[PDB]
Enzyme design. Structure first.
Site, PDB file in Angstrom:
ATOM      1  N   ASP A 192      -2.141  -5.203   0.892  1.00 58.55           N
ATOM      2  CA  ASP A 192      -1.532  -4.083   1.603  1.00 58.55           C
ATOM      3  C   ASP A 192      -0.110  -4.356   2.070  1.00 58.55           C
ATOM      4  OD1 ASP A 192      -3.753  -2.362   1.404  1.00 58.55           O
ATOM      5  OD2 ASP A 192      -4.726  -3.383   3.080  1.00 58.55           O
ATOM      6  N   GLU A 241       0.835  -1.190   0.000  1.00 55.91           N
ATOM      7  CA  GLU A 241       0.000   0.000   0.000  1.00 55.91           C
ATOM      8  C   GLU A 241       0.879   1.253   0.000  1.00 55.91           C
ATOM      9  OE1 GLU A 241      -3.939   0.424   0.136  1.00 55.91           O
ATOM     10  OE2 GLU A 241      -2.548   1.804  -0.893  1.00 55.91           O
ATOM     11  N   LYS A 272     -14.869  -7.741   2.697  1.00 51.82           N
ATOM     12  CA  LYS A 272     -13.503  -7.864   2.202  1.00 51.82           C
ATOM     13  C   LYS A 272     -13.259  -9.250   1.620  1.00 51.82           C
ATOM     14  CE  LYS A 272     -10.285  -4.674   2.614  1.00 51.82           C
ATOM     15  NZ  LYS A 272     -10.423  -3.397   1.887  1.00 51.82           N
TER      16      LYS A 272
END
Ligand SMILES: O=C(NCCc1ccccc1)c1nc([C@@H]2CCCN2C(=O)c2c(Cl)cccc2Cl)[nH]c(=O)c1O
Ligand SMILES: [Mg+2]
Ligand SMILES: [Mn+2]
Ligand code: NA
Length: 178
Positions: free
Chosen positions: A89, A61, A115
């Site tokens: 991430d 990320e 998610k």
């Protein structure tokens, strides 16, 4: 709330959040709740990667798309794990798995399911934080030690309390969508 974000978060986090919003035609000075949410997720990702030993995590990320995928594809070629469909991430070198970090203004179990259905990457590990000290991770495997997790949850609670003291929280709390 724009003033809050700019004094609350580190300038490189703020610059990254601004860029991410403008890349989708959104004005950080107008969609300020979204501004704050992006900054918070970024700060959590950076805190998470500082949680283990030096070199335990790779941060994905916060990179531009080409560099982010160069990191992902590199890791996949060096360790053999399956390449994810979406950018995760972090990568965890100790557990040899990608991590998807979530920070929710709603409840952690609903966000976890969302998610999970969104990424459909059976191998990616999911870890969710709320602003009120709740977390939810794949297989109840939380990766970091309790001290590191406590630091993250404590920071999120501080942000939450700061917003509330400025009468910004209830607008922020109700701004997240499914
Ligand atoms: O990696 C992420 N985004 C990659 C790029 C991307 C961009 C759009 C859709 C999918 C993926 C990412 N994104 C989000 C949340 C939900 C999806 C969007 N979003 C944002 O924060 C966000 C961003 Cl980035 C830009 C403008 C507005 C928003 Cl609301 N939550 C995460 O936990 C996360 O890891
Ligand atoms: Mg991400
Ligand atoms: Mn994330
Ligand atoms: Na995502």
């Amino acid at each position: 709330m724009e003033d809050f974000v700019r004094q609350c978060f580190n300038p490189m986090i703020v610059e990254l959040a601004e860029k991410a919003m403008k890349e989708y035609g959104e004005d950080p000075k107008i969609e300020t709740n979204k501004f704050a949410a992006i900054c918070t997720h970024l700060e959590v990702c950076f805190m998470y990667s500082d949680g283990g030993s030096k070199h335990r995590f790779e941060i994905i990320e916060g990179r531009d798309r080409i560099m982010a995928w160069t990191v992902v594809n590199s890791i996949c070629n060096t360790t053999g794990v399956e390449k994810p469909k979406f950018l995760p991430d972090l990568y965890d070198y100790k557990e040899n798995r990608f991590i998807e970090i979530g920070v929710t203004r709603r409840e952690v179990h609903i966000y976890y399911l969302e998610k999970a259905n969104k990424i459909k990457s059976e191998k990616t590990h999911i870890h969710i934080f709320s602003f009120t000290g709740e977390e939810m991770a794949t297989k109840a495997d939380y990766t970091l030690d309790e001290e590191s997790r406590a630091r993250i949850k404590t920071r999120l609670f501080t942000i939450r309390q700061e917003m509330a003291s400025r009468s910004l929280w209830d607008s922020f709390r109700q701004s997240e969508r499914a």
